[PDB]
From a paper:
Using ancestral sequence reconstruction (ASR) and protein resurrection, we inferred and experimentally characterized the last common ancestors of these groups (ancestral chaperonins ACI, ACII, and ACIII). We selected several AC nodes for protein synthesis and purification, including the last common ancestors of Group I (ACI), Group II (ACII), and Group III (ACIII), along with the ancestor of the Fibrobacteres–Chlorobi–Bacteroidetes (FCB) Group (AFCB).
Finally, our structural characterization of AFCB (Ancestral FCB Chaperonin) revealed a strikingly modern architecture. There was no need for the addition of ATP to generate a stable, homogeneous population of double-ring oligomers. ACIII assembled as eight-subunit double rings without ATP-Mg²+, and AFCB formed 7-subunit double rings. Unsurprisingly, AFCB closely resembles E. coli GroEL, sharing a 71% sequence identity. Although resurrecting the GroES-type cochaperonin was beyond the scope of this study, an analysis of key residues involved in the GroEL-GroES interaction showed that all three essential residues are conserved in AFCB. This strongly suggests that AFCB likely interacts with a GroES-type cochaperonin, hinting at the co-evolution of the chaperonin and its cochaperonin counterpart within the FCB lineage. We selected the FCB group as a more modern ancestor reference because of its well-definition in the phylogenetic tree, and because of its peculiarity of encoding a putative archaeal pathway for ether-bound isoprenoid membrane lipids besides the bacterial fatty acid membrane pathway, that support the hypothesis that LUCA possessed a heterochiral “mixed archaeal/bacterial membrane”, possibly a remnant from before bacteria and archaea diverged. The Group III chaperonin from C. hydrogenoformans, a thermophile, showed the highest rate of ATP hydrolysis, followed by AFCB. AFCB and ACIII showed similar patterns, with a small initial increase in LDH activity before stabilizing at ∼75% activity after 35 min. Tracking these probabilities across nodes revealed dynamic shifts: residues that potentially prevent double-ring formation in ACI gradually gave way to substitutions that favor stable double-ring interfaces.
Residue numbers in the entry:
A (entry chain N), B (entry chain M), C (entry chain C): 2 to 523
D (entry chain B): 450 to 523
Write the structure that this text describes.
């Protein structure tokens, strides 16, 4: 059986679910935010002042409210930032826009024209957000934005600024737990390709949704993997080696996947599988390049090596690898460097050889991918737990600084969306309903400030009004209850605010244009 | 343990079920439709904008309503097109006609006369629709209709136009996931006959309800297969070979099918089985034809070969074999080309020799279905996921172009059904109740147009009146809201509209003349 | 505090009330109808096969149904005939038309078009009945029709035939309760004008709703009477005389009416009041004519006569004055015959003198009513109850024959309405709903005969078809179960059928086009 | 206009759109269902419709701007 709700009843149930998730999450917004307690099975109370954590333990009894909750949760979480105020800002914006849109279109508006107006004004406000952002490019200012990112600790800001200078803007920087007491920085060779694991049952660091293998074995394979019968000796010699093996194959599926899941869950064998990087003839190209990186050899039928022919000598070796959901990192592939610079030489020989722009672009990407290198930081401090907290801080600073160099910075604390609303002053849609949608999103842009100061328990209207009278970077610093942000340095990357607003507009559009809902009866 | 309802109670239960299904499907219609949110048992909620997926997720609690919903879903699913607006329009028309039919028979009308009137007016509307559809005949206009089908992309338009002129009007196209970055076209030998798999548990790609093999083995058999004891070594040598297996036999049933299902579901073996193509002497001849196409040999008691005696040498080989419910395709059978052209020459020799027209026609269709070959559209693009949706787009374009060349094209958006109402102006039945049925099906032809514009949020009355005031292909472009459809390039094949209206009439008549419904006690 | 109900719910309540009334009443229709027991507060319960008595005792609990029943009662009661089969036929036709009309309005029909179609169709049926009616202009066939209306005893038939033959068509006949055993007929001087009593508290014979004054005194007043103080001497001398008084004046209202009502209800003074005949100058002239007719004198200020000084000599003298709701008869005004014939001579002197045709027509009307006289039939028999029963029989015969010569005669038993359905075969309105209304009333014309035969316990479809295949006056006679009505002597006047059908169509028109009913909460 | 044309059982939107397209005294004659009103002779004084519109605006404003209704218990 399946329950079905149509039109206003369905939309109201979805609004109820989204409102419940909002009031669950919106309270933990800002510096002076509230705290939410969690009941966990066979454990103590745990409180959380971060909106990402409180979101994930939301699941409602009523199926309709539940789908609304999971809808806003998923579309809101597509933003890049995970440190904070990325999944909460989007959620409060989504609640605001959805509430006003549904509760106006109940008063006789056209939902589709409302969605059109919402999208138009979101385009206008993201354009203004791009215009407003101050770019960051240079050592002193990336150090400054890192320090603002790292809770005002100059040394981590200096370290990360230096690192992103060494490797390059588009380059890759990774952090890892160290054994020493000092903090230092090296840049090694390595690869990172945007193909993650094949199933989620390899995550070792469940706290961070990543799987890590130490001193692994890398099999460079080109063909498919379907059958259990053919990969026995590799697994046996890996178990006899007592080290992990990471599987890079064309397509692992079926009984092979079932068997490796079984032995991974049982813990007998530390194994992980990822999709093969590249595409086609260039899949073969980057596969043989990463083979010569890691020091192994390719296993492919064009050179007459069956899968079971692979041995210790043919396998590829490195030190550390991380398998996140999207990408995968290879750092310091244990291979002789002379052939690596020979690879780079033949790469530039290809540069001067080729003629077509598509070839030039893709192989310049390859050059940056191999010769660019991997920045590694040996974060270290006095005690273990403080070192864990320090590496967490380094990771958050890395993400924030990467976003800042990507698309500038904006005055944070909810005032960026205030100053971005100036572009909505003299914009009129094709009809009255689109102007209504423009007004709705204009009213919704200021809700982060309203709630960031409502969490502080002050009157919101006075502060938002006298923030609106200002211009430039004038705004409310919620931490100190002052009225400057230019250099006060409570800032957010423009990218996180832009994508939070875009996601909120998207989910509001998909939610205002729904008049049918389908759920199971328990 | 059964509940039986009679007469108006049963018909009202059917009306309630069909109304729920249609309202669930009516929402997603036209280019300005609205969303529907459906959860899966595990994971994210899913948003949809086509009626097909929403149709597949309807199943109600009251058994009578569920029964009516399944009824209309099944008969509405019989339209050949699967892209969209074929099953949605069928459900819309069926709900409209059924509603008005019950809502008129409450006034004392005779349901038999209503059914006869609906059928007669539907036949007249089909005749007018056929007279209205413009023919498509020429590579240029085939390219145009392909481009309109493919969201205004000329490269696919020229691709399918070239393929269609190369293979022929009744020829066969097959789309495959290339490994290369360029989309090329080839003409290769192959086969196709209208019979599929013997069990619904045998689908590999459940996304499109179709099973597929890659580089299989083809055995040719003449008799039945019933038991396990007679087909051990063929399966053993296949499993040692490590390739999939296609099976052609007279009929497979019983323990053989049971063991095949076990070995497939367990994943030990890749196998397939479809029925024999032809009949009598024609079965023997066409079996020999597929055998000499694929390079194998026939197995039969007439020539003294036992199924166990078959070996690798006798087996047939191919590269891509596709099995769906109705048909199946063989491409590039590994055979010697000289023997195939010799077969063609012997076929035409018999064509000159034969005299009877029936055997003549059988020979011409055999010659066409053998010598024509299989076109191979190798769909290549840059990345993987964009290539995959590209493959989906060209599959949809292939189906749409095939329908358009089959039975012409007409204005889309429901305008074709509007313009066909001119034929029913002077069509009167034998009695008054048939005239009421004619009026009933007249009033339903504008319901599709009324709902494409009702999802747009505008009053359907003005647009339908003002398009009735027009003539020819004057129509409502729901995308851009101007009033030209002649060259504007929003259309539908006349075949899909014809089939949708006919299926709607069939279910309308079958529900109108229903007065007893039997279901079980939960 | 008043309840309000709109839309189809109010019409459903009205239909329920009409259904209750019709089911109470329609069982009595026909020659062999059924019985309707009714509750009597004091004494035995009453049984009646006569529908008008059954109709008068209908009043339901839920006010909307009472409201609907009362509307049908009020419309149907306006039929000229009171003997029977006039109100019941109208009720049955209204039931059929209203039920079919609601079922078709719920089918999706415009009530405006349905009402207009019913009006057009009933006009067509009225024209057909006009065409089909056999005229009665002649002494012999009025004798036959009188015999039919009197249950086949020729004596009363020839009596009323001669009474007509003397009195004239527009001339007026009354029934007098005779004292002698023999039945005698007299043509005497009398008067008639259509002005009834001023209040219903004047009725003496409530069985027929008419007030009778035996040998009364009549005064002829020209001015207005309002209050008590002027009329003391007149009622003083009248009470001293011990005979009734007939009040003819311009208008009586207020304290004067209160006084005469008071002394009437107590029985102290037996009196009756009716307005003067004509208008203005015509009132004065015709008041003076009735004054000469009754032997009295006018009481006008023009001749300097007050009312207080009026004496018995100025009063008029007659024998009987039947005061009903609308008419009032004078018989044998005690006036010297020479004077009235001289006044007739003066009327003819005025007829030749005047030139205008309008005044000529009114003077001819004056001559006809004055010189025409009033025929009186003295009905006599042996016993008491037999003589009153014969009085009732002749009263019914008088009404029946009057209507019959008014508009002819047609076949009875609903056959006239059946054969009148031939006209509606080729009548089509401007649009479909009008044709639906035409069909609705065509089915409704079948209902009188269908109920007539259903009360006989037979099957309606067989007889209604077998009557329809016939032509002319071929029809079903339920008294003897034969199939001829030409000379079988079961007919009804065309006037009663026409009036019943028109009244039924009118009530249907008012009821189908109602969308709010406002009632009183108990 | 929607209610006068809906009391006749006709769909209001088409009539109101196609009379709004007209200019001047072009109008819908409900008695005859024709589309001219200049000399056809269905006229209302400007005073009656003016005062009707004034009173409608007044009652609407006075009912919108009302927060509490004070009524006796039966």
């Amino acid at each position: 059986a399946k329950q079905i709700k149509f039109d206003t009843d369905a939309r109201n149930a979805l609004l109820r679910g989204v409102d419940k998730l909002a009031d669950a999450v919106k309270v933990t917004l800002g510096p002076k935010g509230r705290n939410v307690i969690i009941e966990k099975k066979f454990g103590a109370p745990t409180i959380t002042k971060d909106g990402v954590t409180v979101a994930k333990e939301i699941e409602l009894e009523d199926p309709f409210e539940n789908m609304g909750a999971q809808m806003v949760k998923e579309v809101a979480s597509k933003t890049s930032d995970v440190a904070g105020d990325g999944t909460t800002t989007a959620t409060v914006l989504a609640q605001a826009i959805v509430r006003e849109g549904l509760k106006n279109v109940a008063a006789g508006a056209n939902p589709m024209d409302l969605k059109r107006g919402i999208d138009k004004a979101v385009e206008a406000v993201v354009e203004e957000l791009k215009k407003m952002a101050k770019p960051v490019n240079g050592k002193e200012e990336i150090a400054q934005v890192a320090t603002i990112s790292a809770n005002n600790d100059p040394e981590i800001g200096k370290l990360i600024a230096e690192a992103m200078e060494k490797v390059g803007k588009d380059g890759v920087i990774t952090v890892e737990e160290s054994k020493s007491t000092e903090t230092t920085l090296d840049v090694v060779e390595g690869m990172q390709f945007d193909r993650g694991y094949l199933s989620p049952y390899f995550v070792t660091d469940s706290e961070k949704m990543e799987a890590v293998l130490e001193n692994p074995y890398i099999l460079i394979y080109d063909k498919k993997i379907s059958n259990m019968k053919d990969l026995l000796p590799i697994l046996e010699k890996v178990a006899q080696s007592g080290k992990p093996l990471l599987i890079i194959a064309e397509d692992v599926e079926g009984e092979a996947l079932a068997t490796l899941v079984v032995n991974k869950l049982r813990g007998t064998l530390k194994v992980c599988a990822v999709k093969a990087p590249g595409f086609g003839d260039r899949r073969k190209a980057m596969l043989e390049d990463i083979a010569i990186l890691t020091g192994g050899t390719v296993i492919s039928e064009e050179t007459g090596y069956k899968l079971e022919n692979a041995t210790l000598d043919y396998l590829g070796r490195a030190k550390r690898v991380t398998i996140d959901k999207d990408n995968t990192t290879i750092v310091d592939g244990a291979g002789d460097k002379e052939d690596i610079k020979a690879r780079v030489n033949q790469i530039k020989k290809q540069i001067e050889n080729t003629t077509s722009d598509y070839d030039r672009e893709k192989l310049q990407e390859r050059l940056a991918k191999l010769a660019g290198g991997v920045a590694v930081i040996k974060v270290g401090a006095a005690t273990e737990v403080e070192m864990k907290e320090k590496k967490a801080r380094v990771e958050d600073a890395l993400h924030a600084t990467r976003a800042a160099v990507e698309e500038g910075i904006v005055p944070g604390g909810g005032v960026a969306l205030i100053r971005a609303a100036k572009a909505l002053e003299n914009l009129e849609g094709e009809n009255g309903d689109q102007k209504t949608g423009v007004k709705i999103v204009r009213r919704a842009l200021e809700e982060p400030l309203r709630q960031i100061v409502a969490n502080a328990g002050l009157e919101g209207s006075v502060v938002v009004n006298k923030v609106k009278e200002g211009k430039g970077n004038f705004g409310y610093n919620a931490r100190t209850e002052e009225y400057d942000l230019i250099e006060a340095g409570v800032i957010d990357p423009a990218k996180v605010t832009r994508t939070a607003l875009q996601n909120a507009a998207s989910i509001a559009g998909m939610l205002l244009t729904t008049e049918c809902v389908i759920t199971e009866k328990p």
